UniProtKB/TrEMBL annotation, chain A:
Name of protein: Uncharacterized protein
Upper lineage: Eukaryota, Sar, Alveolata, Perkinsozoa, Perkinsea
Record field: transmembrane: 30-49
Originating species: Perkinsus marinus (strain ATCC 50983 / TXsc)
Record keywords, A-Z: Membrane, Transmembrane, Transmembrane helix
Length: 84, 248
């Protein structure tokens, strides 16, 4: 019967590895939350980047021609040298 | 038959010394933790239940059940029937009920029931009950007027474990002071469970009136007043030494 007791004692030998697995499973289930975080960061930090990187980050969809008709810097609406 | 005990013949099972290393090989396999795993999609996910899926089943082997009787060298009698069911019912009966209590020992039989499946020499209370649970076993202990029974209902595959756990209640029980004190709660619950069943309550009244302050009359449940004075691990152990034995 000590044999039975040995197994019943040993069934919990690897507690540290089981608790690590549980927390990894939690971390796995949080990974999908990146799909909303990373874009939201770039959305807020877009204006910090330079014009050249703004274009790459958007795959060319944004460029200087896409700056508003009334750009926040009035002297640079329609380009760095103005409209004409 | 090698031994006749109280009118019945038993086959004597001899004690043998085996290494823990060799018996471990025969213990049923089970895990408490599942740390990773091998993914495998449910193959029958698209198979309706009306379509049989099992093929090449071994032919059944049916045997007429017969009751077989054996006895260990310590004097413990073993009686078993196999109806070839898939769930087993293991029970340990001890010839120590309320009728054997002296007036100063009132309620001690019930107290033994209350401390059942607590810490043993080689297993803590929590580990005993969590094992019985993870293996899907149900059971408990009931103290009567003539006997006390420890029963466990289990899937037959896990009998090696269940037998050990049941026997440990009578072989090397650690009646630790603070674990026994935690069992005082069960007395009030027992009284409520008895009084709820009106037929059984009226039966308890009958026996107490029929046999006045003697064997069968002796109350089946301990009271929660003056009886708690000797609701102690030491007192329980002395009671067990008097009545609990392999021969009974
Ligand atoms: C699969 C196909 C993928 C194609 C990706 C193309 C990306 C082009 C980006 C580009 O040139 O942007 C120009 C911009 C600006 O460059 P530019 O100012 O010379 O402009 C390009 C030239 N014109 C103006 C004509 C369009 O540069 C970038 O944004 C460069 C980003 C590089 C990022 C490198 C990350 C490395 C990480 C390494 C990790 C491991 C170590
Ligand atoms: C795998 C695909 C490989 C082929 C990729 C070709 C990329 C050509 C980029 C180019 O010439 O851009 C110049 C553009 C515009 O050049 P520009 O800065 O000189 O301005 C153009 C305006 N004129 C002509 C009037 C001066 O520059 C950029 O976009 C710079 C940043 C790079 C953009 C990111 C890398 C390319 C992404 C390709 C995605 C492919 C998926 C399909 C298309 C999705 C979008 C519609
Ligand atoms: C709860 C948690 C809430 C968190 C909220 C975080 C808010 C972050 C906001 C970031 C804003 C970045 C700047 C956006 C903007 O409008 O920029 C204006 C202005 C545009 O300047 P340009 O002339 O284009 O030249 C500078 C280089 N491009 O740039 C800035 O002000 C940049 C400031 C960068 C700060 C970086 C902080 C990290």
């Amino acid at each position: 019967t000590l044999a039975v007791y040995h197994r019943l004692w040993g069934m919990t030998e690897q507690f540290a590895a089981r608790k690590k697995w549980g927390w990894r499973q939690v971390y796995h289930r949080m990974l999908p939350f990146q799909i909303a975080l990373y874009p939201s960061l770039m959305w807020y930090l877009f204006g910090w980047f330079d014009d050249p990187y703004k274009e790459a980050m958007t795959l060319g969809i944004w460029n200087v021609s896409k700056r508003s008709l009334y750009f926040w810097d009035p002297l640079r609406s329609g380009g760095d040298k103005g409209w004409y | 038959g090698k031994s006749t005990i109280q009118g019945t013949s038993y086959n004597v099972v001899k004690f043998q010394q085996e290494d823990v290393s060799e018996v471990v090989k025969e213990v049923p396999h089970f895990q408490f933790y599942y740390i990773g795993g091998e993914h495998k999609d449910n193959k029958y996910r698209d198979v309706p239940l009306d379509i049989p899926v099992l093929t090449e089943a071994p032919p059944p082997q049916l045997k007429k059940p017969e009751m077989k009787f054996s006895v260990l060298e310590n004097g413990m009698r073993i009686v078993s029937v196999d109806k070839q069911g898939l769930t087993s019912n293991l029970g340990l009966f001890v010839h120590a009920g309320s009728r054997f209590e002296t007036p100063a020992e009132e309620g001690l039989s019930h107290m033994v029931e209350c401390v059942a499946f607590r810490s043993t020499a080689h297993l803590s209370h929590l580990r005993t009950i969590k094992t019985i649970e993870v293996l899907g076993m149900n059971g408990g202990c009931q103290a009567g007027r003539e006997h006390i029974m420890y029963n466990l209902e289990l899937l037959r595959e896990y009998m090696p474990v269940a037998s050990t756990l049941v026997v440990g209640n009578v072989l090397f029980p650690r009646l630790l002071p603070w674990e026994v004190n935690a069992c005082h709660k069960e007395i009030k619950k027992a009284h409520e469970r008895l009084k709820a069943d009106t037929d059984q309550y009226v039966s308890e009244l009958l026996h107490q009136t029929a046999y006045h302050n003697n064997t069968l009359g002796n109350a089946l449940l301990a009271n929660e007043g003056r009886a708690l004075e000797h609701f102690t691990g030491d007192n329980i152990r002395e009671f067990m030494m008097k009545h609990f034995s392999a021969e009974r």
